[PDB]
Design a protein around this ligand. Structure first.
Ligand SMILES: C#Cc1ccc(NC(=O)OC[C@]23CN(S(=O)(=O)c4ccc(C(C)(C)C(=O)O)cc4C)C[C@H]2C[C@H]2C[C@@H]3C2(C)C)cc1
Length: 382
């Protein structure tokens, strides 16, 4: 207990962390279909665009029967059901996105959704782990994980660019997986004092984070800024600090009082903090207020991924190891990882500017947090 990353064997981290060697934090080969028993749920989730557009969604949810979650017997089926019910819930609350909101989630969604969220230790609102990490398939199983060979499972509105936004995000996560699988090698090389093994491990991580950033560049080709800001972002909005639901949402039949849960945040992806921790970068941007927000978003990650991040912080310090040596190869390799991270943060800042800050105009605290985490990262260059 408390001795850093648990291992399944001499090569691979513990399966308890639910990190896949091929897709990383993403869920491997997600389930696309629920048991027959939940067909009515699947129908609504598959037809969300035309049900919202026609004004039919809320009545159709209001006519659902209460389905027990007992027939969701494995992790993949529970994650698919969370995605389905999360999408239905966002669509039910926000409707067409023009301010006609519902403040009471009907019990025939609220209860199984809340029970399932309790099993998975995730809040009962859509999170990154649902709409990106489990929200995909290959078109052709025998072809590789590329944009052209992939699709999402659920969208909110036709033209909302959710395929572009979610798949490009997923593909960045998959690119980062090639870096994550090297982490045990880094710490093994430190224990063994294997200079070359550590060096090549850091070069491989740096190379995979460079590639992940080139995947991120694809967002511009599949997401229209106006459609993202004025349409998709509605359905990723939550009811924590939201003046449209100032007390939260009533989960009918689960809690008596309304409850607040936060909407999507880039802070729900584990990738940034994973490599900040590995490399010993300590983010300071935004003070205790940003730390509390970002820790709360950590509780919106799958619990096993939280435990991975927390075990990482207990391992020996890579940065301190490289700092204990007059070794230019190690310093340059460490620096390549940090530079790749700086570039990923710098690009993050540019995307927030083009896809949120600019549309909004057509705020200041967000642009300066992104600038500050970028300069904190840059100041970690050894
Ligand atoms: C529920 C849910 C929900 C929760 C989270 C997310 N997305 C997310 O966590 O993505 C991580 C990213 C960051 N972006 S992003 O384009 O900068 C980005 C991400 C998220 C937003 C949202 C819509 C939440 C917002 O604030 O309005 C806005 C923007 C501009 C993409 C992705 C790629 C790289 C940079 C990291 C990455 C390392 C993997 C989507 C839905």
């Amino acid at each position: 207990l408390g001795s850093g990353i648990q291992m399944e064997n001499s090569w691979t981290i513990s399966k308890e962390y639910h990190i896949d060697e091929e897709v990383g934090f993403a869920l491997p080969n997600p389930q696309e279909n629920l048991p027959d028993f939940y067909n009515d749920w699947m129908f609504i989730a598959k037809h969300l665009p035309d049900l919202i557009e026609s004004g039919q969604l809320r009545e159709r949810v209001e006519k659902l029967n209460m389905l027990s979650i007992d027939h969701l017997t494995d992790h993949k089926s529970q994650r698919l059901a969370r995605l389905v019910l999360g999408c239905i819930t966002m669509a039910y609350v926000w409707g067409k996105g023009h301010g006609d909101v519902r403040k009471v989630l009907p019990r025939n969604i609220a209860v199984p959704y809340c029970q399932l969220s309790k099993k998975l230790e995730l809040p009962p609102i859509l999170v990154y782990a649902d709409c990106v990490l489990a929200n995909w398939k290959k078109k052709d199983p025998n072809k590789p994980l590329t944009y052209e060979n992939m699709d999402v499972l659920f969208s909110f509105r036709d033209g909302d660019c959710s395929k572009g936004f979610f798949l490009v995000s997923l593909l960045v996560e998959i690119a980062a997986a090639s870096a994550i699988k090297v982490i045990p090698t880094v710490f093994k090389a430190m224990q063994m004092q294997e200079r070359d093994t550590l060096l090549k491990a850091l070069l491989e991580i740096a190379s995979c984070l460079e590639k992940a950033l080139q995947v991120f560049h694809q967002i511009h080709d599949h997401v229209n800024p106006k459609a993202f800001f004025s349409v998709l972002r509605i359905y990723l909005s939550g009811w924590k600090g939201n003046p449209q639901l100032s007390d939260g949402l009533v989960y009918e039949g689960f809690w008596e009082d309304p409850k607040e849960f936060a909407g999507g945040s880039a802070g729900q992806s584990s990738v940034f903090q994973c490599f900040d921790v590995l490399l010993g970068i300590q983010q300071t941007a935004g003070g205790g207020h940003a730390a509390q927000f970002l820790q709360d978003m950590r509780r919106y990650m799958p619990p096993a991924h939280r435990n991975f991040l927390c075990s990482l912080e207990s391992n020996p310090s890579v940065r301190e190891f490289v700092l204990s040596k007059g070794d230019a190869g190690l310093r340059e390799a460490y620096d390549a990882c940090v530079k790749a991270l700086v570039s990923l943060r710098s690009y993050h800042l540019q995307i927030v500017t083009k896809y949120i800050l600019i549309p909004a105009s057509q705020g200041t605290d967000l642009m300066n947090f992104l600038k500050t985490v970028r300069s904190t990262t840059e100041k970690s260059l050894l």
